[PDB]
């Protein structure tokens, strides 16, 4: 009905106010769901539930590791006396979600290698510390960290263990050593379009198109503008992949579009007031993220580490630090950032 | 005559005031020339013309790519609402000049590979964004970026494409793997001295001695102190190359002196009030830049990327952040920095 | 007697006040001794003497290079007009001590290769500049550099020269390329416990257990809490080495515990008011430093450079930038940091 279309969209402030006075177990589950959703800048528990459903569709071992990471990161943020409003908003759980997910994804062992849950825990514990340190650094420029605890922690882990580790071996990443055989006639446009939901789903490390579809559904039910910019960023990523002559097997996998999804979501509406100048700037940031992800992948394959989400964080920080005399390119303060619709409403209200 | 020796030297403020009220096409050409000259801290359109002549002497394809990069960077700075006084001073064109130049230099394809003009444009467009982000960062310490948009953009491009790219392959850079055979009797001092103008010309990527001579001529006609410090920095680079046992073929090429030229120019008179303490500090910064360029070259050859001008930027930022109780080592504010002669005049006026 | 137990412990303020009015040669020797001791956060000349004795026990060539580095760094800090109170406190000599030490340790040539004293001097001269630049950066967050001049300088040197240099070749560092054969039955617990003093001694690059014992003695006679946290950090390093499946030959060498010693010393009492929360945070920082040192070692072996003390500096900066609502985790201002006992006394006095 029309009544649920108000209590299920946005950040779900009504449900948050209703749950604020309940058992702390339910509040912790709500925080874990919001942290699951917050990977794509969504503070919605129902979106988090749908994202968890998608993770289960992809790989139940991966969602086990991700849930463990989120729980451990939220608990470490509680124990470290972090801001309760940030913990209740899932801002201390998405880095741990990604840590657990990508530590299960890049594990050379089989599924359900239960010994992997010790590094998952010990690395997800270090996400609140990195988040607080990087916030102490960035607070002088009103910048978010965006995934930098996760990137630092997972790069540290995948370099400490490496492929030739005895307990927790990682997958082998090697630099390119031969000009790829690219036959442009053997090109599947069905798979190219399928790489848009796969590109959205690769934000969590899931190469299944149905999980990407579920993620898109969650994005839409929280904020349609976030879903639109996610789709457009994935398209931009695919296009930039094609423009630099990339093997089609890498474009189909979505390994070229998940760093542009987050950049488009962040620039177009989330941390800039959404206008058409902001939309073009988001497209430019998605393109810059695609090319920077190419660079960082080719550069970190030498060390044997996957690119992670370094490209997204770096280029989004770059485009947030950009200063423009255009009054239509307006960067919202970090305290007034909820989602593109409310952001645009606040922008219009403070401008007029 | 003596009259032109006033309207052709310095930043050419008289010609700038005369052109301020003319057709915007002429003003844009003036901005492009000033941006060409601003690579070596020179805000002079005639110096930019002489530098363009030198680029034509080296390789007309390289000057085509460089001119395209400068034009595209100035246009992107205009579209992004950047500061008009900084665009009119060429501060938004030298990074694009270097981007285009070094993207044509490190291209595996032949000359006039017209498809290279698309990455040149798309990478020169990203130089104003990087410049504005790094200025938002550095404004808290009164620091210039010095070439950091260019370094970031070109490293990103040369890592995204790489040697094994299908469309835009780059030259192969490999780390050292054997102790070089250095015969100190087969040593040409003529070529050693020729490596000083070649070292000045390698700032733009030109290994021809006549282009380096033309660059020196431009430096002198704008500011004789800049030309002197450029020559001394190139000498210091050559000496530091000899001191660490470098193959003579690399010293002759000037690949050891172009990162010390810029450092000496920046420290001795440009961003410090020129004294003898400042001169010694500039020599020390040139030596530090030579050794840091050795390090960064040996370190980035593993990733297959040339050192660029990372050494210069890093060591110059280091020597500008240096705090000294010596009243003779005075760092000018970024608003009062034009060229060493005017800088010293301002220093004397505000000190006395 | 009980009288010397007051004039030999702590920062030796009485002896400093007595020597303040003597020949500048004696004052310079005192500064060099304090700089030798300041590697492990100790401003004590007797501790510096004992550390020099330990360096002589390890390798007289290494202590020659270290002493030369300390002298050259203190002289360069004097010539660069640095703060006299920081030079008198050895804050400008420990980076040069480590530079000289680790440049002699990682030299492919034999002992007493007297030509190595030129790079030692020229690299120790660059430690005051790096220290002043990084202090100008960190002063906005009240952070110490902790060894960052040393890390930058020594990484720069070992990358500029490299293994295949003709004058100053360095030792060959190669990345791991095969899963290590780890026989847990062939495990020596005697050597495991011996790796605690060896882990403390590897802070200076000394793998001898007697030098580590001497270092522990110096730590204790200056501040027993510093010695305790050094031992605990070395233990934590050994444990984290065991937890990630490390070859026993690397654990015995102490190459896994010297980056946790400094982190534990820095967090537990030195730069945080020593409590039990601070002690647990120091253990966590030591564990994070062990894993980050694993990562940085595996990552910098690709470039052929040893990890140095990058892990310590980075993780300690991370844990100092951490902001906590816990009133018991209190970060002292940089001006009121002498040693854990005086730090705790000051904390109690300002809290009550
Ligand atoms: C930006 C978004 C753009 C979206 C465009 C969406 C679609 C874009 C690509 C679709 C067209 C591909 C044409 C099929 C094969 C053509 C061919 O075979 O060669 C023709 C030339 C390649 O020259 P080559 O001789 O090396 O051929 C290689 C085969 N060989 C090696 C065996 C000889 O093609 C091009 O120069 C493509 C130029 C790309 C223009 C976009 C610029 C983006 C670069 C920015 C990087 C910043 C970092
Ligand atoms: C600073 C500016 C200085 C300008 C000086 C300008 C000129 C400087 C170099 C000109 C002299 C070269 C002598 C000809 C060959 C000598 C030889 O063959 O060997 C004699 C020794 C090398 O010892 P080795 O046994 O390895 O011989 C190698 C041959 N082999 C491997 C086959 C056995 O020479 C030296 O130790 C040179 C010491 C350099 C002093 C300057 C210090 C700068 C280092 C800073 C790094 C910071 C980073
Ligand atoms: C934290 C401090 C903890 C201190 C603990 C102090 C002691 C900790 C280690 C002592 C126990 C070693 C057991 C002897 C060999 C066992 C064995 O052989 O295998 C059993 C499994 C390994 O599985 P796998 O099949 O690969 O066997 C490898 C042999 N193969 C390849 C030939 C098949 O063991 C484990 O999963 C150990 C789990 C480690 C738990 C600590 C988590 C720390 C990770 C944080 C990283 C963040 C970055």
Numbering used by the authors:
A (entry chain C), B (entry chain B), C (entry chain A): 91 to 442
What is the paper's account of this structure, in its own sentences?
Supporting the observation that both C- and N-terminal halves of HsUT-A are present, MS of its tryptic digests showed the presence of both N-terminal and C-terminal peptides. Despite extensive data processing efforts, including static classification and particle heterogeneity analysis tools, it was not possible to separate the two species or to isolate maps with pseudo-heterooligomeric arrangement. As the majority of residues in the map are in line with the N-terminal half of HsUT-A (i.e., HsUT-A3), we built the model for its N-terminal sequences and based our structural analyses primarily on this model. Whereas the extracellular surfaces of HsUT-B and BtUT-B are only mildly negatively charged and DvUT close to net neutral, nearly the entire extracellular surface of HsUT-A shows electrostatic charges of less than −5 kT/e with Adaptive Poisson-Boltzmann Solver (APBS) electrostatics.
The overall structures of HsUT-A and HsUT-B are similar to each other and to BtUT-B and DvUT, showing the trimeric arrangement with 10 TM helices and two pore (P) helices per subunit. In both structures, each subunit hosts a channel-like pore for urea transport and the channels are in the open state with approximately 2 to 3 Å in diameter at constriction formed by V69, T177, L292, and F342.
